[PDB]
Amino acid sequence: EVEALEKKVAALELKVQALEKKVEALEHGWDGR
Amino acid sequence: EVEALEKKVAALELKVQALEKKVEALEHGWDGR
Amino acid sequence: EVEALEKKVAALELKVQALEKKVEALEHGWDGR
Incomplete structure (x- = not known):
C-alpha cells in the first residue's frame, strides 16, 4: 500500500x-502566452 | 492512517x-475562455 | 514512511x-488579472 501511494503522490507532484x-x-x- | 491518506490523495487527484x-x-x- | 508521506501530501495540498x-x-x- 505505501509503495503504491508513494507512486500516486509522485504523479501528483x-x-x-x-x-x-x-x-x-x-x-x-x-x-x- | 493509510486509508485516510488514500482519501487525501484521491481528493488531490x-x-x-x-x-x-x-x-x-x-x-x-x-x-x- | 507514513509520516513522511503525510508531509508530501500536505505540501501538495x-x-x-x-x-x-x-x-x-x-x-x-x-x-x-
Missing part, C-alpha cells in the same frame, strides 16, 4: 509542477 | 484534474 | 490551494 509552470506563464505573459 | 481542465481552457482559449 | 487561487483569478479576471 509532477502534475502540480506542470500546472505551476503553465499558470506562471499565463499570469506573467511569458512568450506572449 | 480530483482537484488536480479540475485545475488541468481549467488551465487547458485558458491556454487554448476554449469557448472564448 | 498547499500547492493545489495556491494554484486554485491563481486560476480562479485568471478565469474571473480578479483585480484585472
